[PDB]
From a paper:
D2R and D3R differ in brain distribution and signaling properties and are both targeted by current antipsychotics and drugs for the treatment of neurological diseases (such as Parkinson’s disease).
Positioning the ligand binding pocket at the center of the cryo-EM box improved the resolution at the D3R extracellular region, and allowed to classify two cryo-EM models containing two FOB02-04A conformations – Conformation A (to a global resolution of 3.05 Å) and B (global resolution of 3.09 Å), which mainly differed in the position of the bitopic SP and residues around the SBP. The PP pocket at the OBS is defined by strong salt bridge interactions with D1103.32, and a cavity formed by S1965.46, F3456.51, F3466.52, W3426.48, V1113.33, T1153.37 and I18345.52, with an additional weak H-bond with S1925.42. Finally, the FOB02-04A SP binds in a groove-shaped pocket at the receptor extracellular region, denoted as SBP2-ECL1-1, and is formed by the tips of TM1, TM2, and ECL1. Remarkably, in contrast to prior D3R structures – whether in active or inactive conformations – the outermost extracellular residues of TM1 undergo a rearrangement that positions H291.32’s imidazole group, situated between TM2 and TM7, to stack with the 1H-indole group of the ligand SP. The D3R TM2-ECL1 harbors an extra glycine residue that is absent in D2R (93GGV95 in D3R vs 98GE99 in D2R), which allows this region to interact with the SP in the D3R and not in the D2R. FOB02-04A binds D3R with all three components (PP, linker, and SP), fully exploiting the OBS, established SBP, and a new extended SBP2-ECL1-1 that confers FOB02-04A with D3R selectivity.
Author numbering:
A (entry chain A): 4 to 54, 182 to 234, 242 to 354
B (entry chain B): 4 to 340
C (entry chain C): 7 to 63
D (entry chain R): 29 to 223, 323 to 400
E (entry chain E): 2 to 120, 136 to 247
Write the structure that this text describes.
């Protein structure tokens, strides 16, 4: 049938197959996340809490889960040409700076970006871990400047709780697919517990996916 | 300065008028007399399994037997198509590759992606392992396509709206081909390796001279971003594929869209285009999970290569033109003949 | 670049204009000539016999 | 009485059609080739063998007036196969219940019903189910179903009957119910901690309601018949309970596959013609 | 790339010996290793082979059972534990690396070898022995095989090797056509199934040595007698 060299080559191919298998099994357990912020939206702060060109890899283990966070900052070109690259990402960690609503507008651009990503045809069965960073600054900024400057027809008090609740509600809009669950969370500077809420969101997404596969969702 | 804008407008007008003047007839009219090729039934001879992620690019070897494949699992698998044996499995530093090239000599393999670096791997090493021969850094955007001129010089296209001719030995950009408004997505070397065409996201394919290092001609007509491009075997025409679900054969000398290949049943985008050995068949990979083989002279949909379970990402035709290799996002490489 | 980019693109269109364009019928005739001349040695047009087909069982 | 014969033939046709559709759907489509789906395939196989190897003998008994004319070994193999198939189906239902429990409470290792851990766990579950159905069913083939008049084929040995009924139905039923109850309470606790429940809850309610309605009234009456002073277990009641026992086999494909979106799009693709 | 082997010495006929070849400068794990011996004043004789990963192990019919080959990937070492010896087992044992894939050049590198002394198949023949040549003209060495080497896949498994006087054999040509890396273009191999020819266009001072023609169609691997070219 096969000559000595053909057989040795087949053995080599089988060893390569076995290595590819092992590597696949090792890599399939990784939780892949896409840190998709907007400039000075608090990407450097959140990534510093978790832990020349091209995307940035941030790998970290937390409670027997290896999270591989992908930061796409160097890509200034059109998004759509590489969004399909992250089609099978577990979740999108979307960062927004609450303070950047009056000063530039920044907030409208953040909402437009969120709309574009959330409604993208590749991110249909993909949950968004929305982070509302720099809450401390918004604490006093709302007390100084009203929220109406950014959101016309607000028709509400310019307090602390309700203004953030409204912003959160306006971000939870523009979501069509019922499968998408936006885990909005408000962070401030550094709390050293955003990894915990990330873990809780990821495990909730995993459970949701498992039940969707079994046919219970 | 409005004088420059109006002068550019009148220039564009002069170009359009010059193009229209020489367009006496259409290829469709001339080719009505020729006999139409009968339906082709290409069968899946081989299915190359082993990738565990979306396959993004492939490139046939010049011997028409070996082929390298790049996927998102950080693996460059060089296959022996005849026996389906994995000849090599190169682990990638960045698992975000969008292109891969096989050197004409068959000694080097280049790849790259969102890392913005063109990694070149030497295969013929004395140590018996494949190590990173060179790391071509300098592009500020994602690397979309790369093609070897020879073992020493390589042309690449990036998402920063620029093509670059690199000298591998020095590892610097010998030439910088700038001018595209949108991200350059595809490259196609002419048979003589003197000129090359680059299709970008501005719906324009530009012809560049490698030696001079500047644009020669610009071809428009696509309504959306171009994804694929391929020269005609003789080296005087080239076909493109865009997201508007149309293939467009342009002629270099005539300098105008020579013929279109569109079907009303097709709406998805095109990812790969390649000609047969004689150039009679135009094989285009679509996002409707199957490849379509068109008559290059009649625009008659000769055949449908179906079977992949996901978007057809890449396809290639061998040097001898024996079989076609289709790599899709279902992590499968099917060889059709 | 405003002025620099406008001058660059105008110069590019100027050098693009000075190109000798052959007739479209000539180009089409060359496409025919090539397609038909090499039709015999294109094994995708016709089913290559199993005797000389390297991709078989 | 011919009504029964024709209705049982219609049940056979419905079962074989449904299971053949599920099997071919899972086979041709590659998105369905999941470890969680292999339990559904196992269940489809079980019900198909119910329809093929068991049901035509029930049709024979019906049309003949409930008198056995074949050899005693044909009655032993009939009761054996029948019990084996039914126990396999019930324990497959329990296996899917445990699979979904693992999916909920143990999500990291379940992943998406893939990998070595999941593939081996499903393979182990299926094996354990089939070997348990064998352990339960094999006594009767060994000449253990003691009988009187040799023109009747029935299971009338209370030593066998009570233990088989307990191990084959009552235990997996109690397990299934406890498991689905734990899944429910865990999902509700997670939903409360957070601050589609309707889908999951409805699917659990329907699957447990279809299992109980179709399997409980047989085993209950069968165990009351075998062990009671004088219980009026009318022939028509026994026939109705057997009917329900086999309409479960017919209904399971629908309740498990037709409510899955990927299965829905698969079936619609198959039946596009 | 180098293979340094140790263990060779005077051994009593009934004694055991453990040859250890330490490899350095290449990916030892991914190379098929051959123990090939050359008897004193005699030709090459393949002894044993162990594949990459210790999956496949072959021995020559003359050493089956007595000899054992073992690999140690962690430390990049090849072992040849010879239990029972005879007066015919004295030889210069070379360790030969050979990677096997499409387009590979197996048997490319040879070790120094250890001189150990003590107190059916493809019959490869040459029928040439001594050839007296002056440097400058062409030389034609003819090798003949008992069985046709042209496998149905479409290549012949012939291997031309050069052993210079007092040096380890070097790969000249593999598959009777392809020149090995570092071989000048003077060497040109041709043939057809059975009859094979090695042609040297211009012979130089360094070409003096023994030329071996080995078959690699099927184990056991059999060498030729060896054509000695000298002044
Ligand atoms: C219900 C399933 C469920 O599966 C079996 C099972 C499984 C597990 C377990 N522990 N115990 C039992 C027990 N089957 C019982 C089923 C096979 C018998 C058929 C009964 N028809 C007659 O005999 C009959 C028909 C007729 C017509 C006229 C007059 C007299 C007649 N008589």
């Amino acid at each position: 049938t096969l000559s000595a060299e053909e057989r040795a080559a087949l053995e080599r191919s089988k060893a390569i197959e076995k290595n590819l298998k092992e590597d696949g099994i090792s890599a399939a357990k990784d939780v892949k996340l896409l840190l998709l912020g907007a400039g000075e939206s608090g990407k450097n702060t959140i990534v510093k809490q978790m832990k020349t060109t091209g995307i940035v890899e941030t790998h970290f283990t937390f409670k027997n889960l290896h999270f591989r966070l992908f930061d796409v900052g160097a890509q200034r070109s059109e998004r759509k040409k590489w969004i399909h690259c992250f089609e099978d990402v577990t979740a999108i960690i979307f960062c927004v700076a609450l303070s950047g609503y009056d000063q530039v507008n920044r907030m409208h651009a953040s909402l437009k970006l969120f709309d574009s990503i959330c409604n993208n045809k590749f991110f249909i069965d993909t949950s968004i871990i929305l982070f509302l960073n720099k809450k401390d600054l918004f604490g006093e900024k709302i007390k100084k400047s009203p929220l109406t400057i950014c959101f016309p027809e607000y028709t509400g008090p310019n307090t602390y709780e309700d203004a953030a609740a409204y912003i959160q509600a306006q971000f939870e809009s523009k979501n069509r697919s019922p499968n998408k669950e936006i885990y909005c969370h408000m962070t401030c500077s550094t709390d050293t517990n955003n990894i915990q809420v990330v873990f809780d969101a990821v495990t909730d997404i995993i459970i949701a996916n498992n039940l969707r596969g079994c046919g219970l969702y | 300065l409005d004088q420059l804008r109006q002068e550019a407008e009148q220039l564009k007008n002069q170009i359009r008028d010059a193009r229209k003047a020489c367009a006496d007839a259409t290829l469709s009219q001339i080719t009505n007399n020729i006999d139409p090729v009968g339906r082709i039934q290409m069968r899946t001879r081989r299915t190359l399994r082993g990738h565990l992620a979306k396959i993004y690019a492939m490139h046939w070897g010049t011997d028409s037997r070996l082929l390298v494949s790049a996927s998102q699992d950080g693996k460059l698998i060089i296959w022996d198509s005849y026996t389906t044996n994995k000849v090599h499995a190169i682990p990638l530093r960045s698992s975000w590759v969008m292109t891969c090239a096989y050197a004409p000599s068959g000694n080097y393999v280049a790849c790259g992606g969102l890392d913005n670096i063109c990694s070149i791997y030497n295969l013929k090493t004395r140590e018996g392992n494949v190590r990173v021969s060179r790391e071509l850094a300098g592009h500020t955007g994602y690397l979309s396509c790369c093609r070897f001129l020879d073992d020493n010089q390589i042309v690449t296209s990036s998402g920063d709206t620029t093509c670059a001719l690199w000298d591998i030995e020095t590892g610097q950009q010998t030439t910088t081909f700038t001018g595209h408004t949108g991200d350059v997505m595809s490259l196609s070397l002419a048979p003589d390796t003197r000129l090359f065409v680059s299709g970008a996201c501005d719906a324009s394919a530009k012809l560049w001279d490698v030696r001079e290092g500047m644009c020669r001609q610009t071809f428009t007509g696509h309504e959306s971003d171009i994804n694929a491009i391929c020269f005609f075997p003789n080296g005087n025409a080239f076909a493109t594929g865009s997201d508007d679900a149309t293939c467009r054969l342009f002629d270099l000398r005539a300098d105008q869209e020579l013929m279109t290949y569109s079907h009303d049943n097709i709406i998805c985008g095109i990812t790969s285009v390649s000609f047969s050995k004689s150039g009679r068949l135009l094989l285009a990979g679509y996002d409707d999970f199957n490849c379509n083989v068109w008559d290059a002279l009649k625009a008659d949909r000769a055949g449908v290569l179906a079977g992949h379970d996901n978007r057809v990402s890449c396809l290639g035709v061998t040097d001898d033109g024996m079989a076609v290799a289709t790599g899709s996002w279902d992590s499968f490489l099917k060889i059709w003949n | 670049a405003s002025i620099a980019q406008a001058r660059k693109l105008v110069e590019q269109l100027k050098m693009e204009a000075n190109i000798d364009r052959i007739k479209v019928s000539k180009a089409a005739a060359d496409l025919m000539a090539y397609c038909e001349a090499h039709a015999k040695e294109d094994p995708l047009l016709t089913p290559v016999p199993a005797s000389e087909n390297p991709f078989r069982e | 009485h011919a009504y029964y014969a024709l209705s049982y033939c219609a049940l056979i046709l419905a079962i074989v059609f449904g299971n053949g559709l599920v099997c071919m759907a899972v086979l041709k489509e590659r998105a369905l080739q999941t470890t969680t789906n292999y339990l559904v395939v196992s269940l489809a196989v079980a019900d198909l063998l119910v329809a093929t190897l068991v049901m035509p003998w029930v049709v024979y008994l019906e049309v003949t007036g409930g008198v056995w004319n074949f050899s005693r070994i044909c009655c032993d193999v009939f009761v054996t196969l029948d019990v084996m198939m039914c126990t396999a189906s019930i324990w497959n239902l329990c296996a899917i219940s445990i699979d979904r429990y693992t999916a909920v409470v143990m999500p990291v290792h379940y992943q998406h019903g893939t990998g070595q851990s999941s593939c081996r766990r499903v393979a182990l579950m299926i094996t354990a189910v089939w070997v348990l159905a064998f352990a339960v069913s094999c006594p009767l083939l060994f000449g253990f179903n003691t009988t009187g008049d040799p023109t009747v084929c029935s299971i009338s040995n209370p030593d066998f009957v009570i233990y088989s009924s307990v191990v084959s139905f009552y235990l997996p039923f109690g397990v299934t119910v406890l498991v689905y109850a734990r899944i429910y309470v865990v999902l509700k606790q997670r939903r409360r901690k957070r601050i589609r429940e309707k889908k999951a809850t409805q699917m659990v309610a329907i699957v447990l309601g279809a299992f109980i309605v179709c399997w409980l009234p047989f085993f209950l009456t069968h165990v009351l018949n075998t062990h009671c002073q004088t219980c009026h277990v009318s022939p028509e009641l026994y026939s109705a309970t057997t009917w329900l026992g086999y309409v479960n086999s017919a209904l399971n494909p629908v309740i498990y596959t037709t409510f899955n979106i990927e299965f829905r799009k698969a079936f619609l693709k198959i039946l596009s013609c | 790339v180098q293979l340094v082997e140790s263990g060779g010495g005077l051994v009593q006929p009934g004694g055991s010996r453990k040859l250890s070849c330490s490899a350095s400068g290449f990916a030892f794990s991914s190379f098929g290793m051959h123990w090939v011996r050359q008897a004193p004043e005699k030709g090459l004789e393949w002894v044993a082979y162990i594949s990459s990963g210790s999956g496949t192990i072959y021995y020559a019919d003359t050493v089956k059972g007595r000899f054992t080959i073992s690999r140690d990937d962690p430390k990049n070492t090849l072992f040849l534990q010879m239990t029972s010896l005879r007066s015919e087992d004295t030889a210069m044992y070379y360790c030969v690396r050979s990677i096997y894939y499409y387009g590979s050049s197996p048997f490319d590198f040879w070790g120094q070898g250890t001189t150990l002394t003590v107190s059916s198949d493809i019959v490869m023949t040459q029928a040439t022995s001594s050839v007296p040549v002056t440097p400058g003209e062409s030389v034609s060495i003819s090798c003949r095989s008992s069985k046709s080497l042209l496998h149905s896949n479409g290549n012949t498994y012939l291997y031309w090797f050069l052993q210079r006087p007092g040096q380890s054999p070097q790969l000249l040509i593999y598959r009777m056509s392809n020149l090995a890396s570092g071989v000048p273009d003077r060497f040109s191999g041709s043939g057809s199934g059975t009859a094979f020819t090695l042609t040297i266009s211009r012979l130089e001072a360094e070409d003096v040595g023994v030329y071996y023609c080995m078959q690699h169609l099927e184990y056991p691997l059999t060498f030729g007698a060896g054509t000695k070219l000298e002044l």
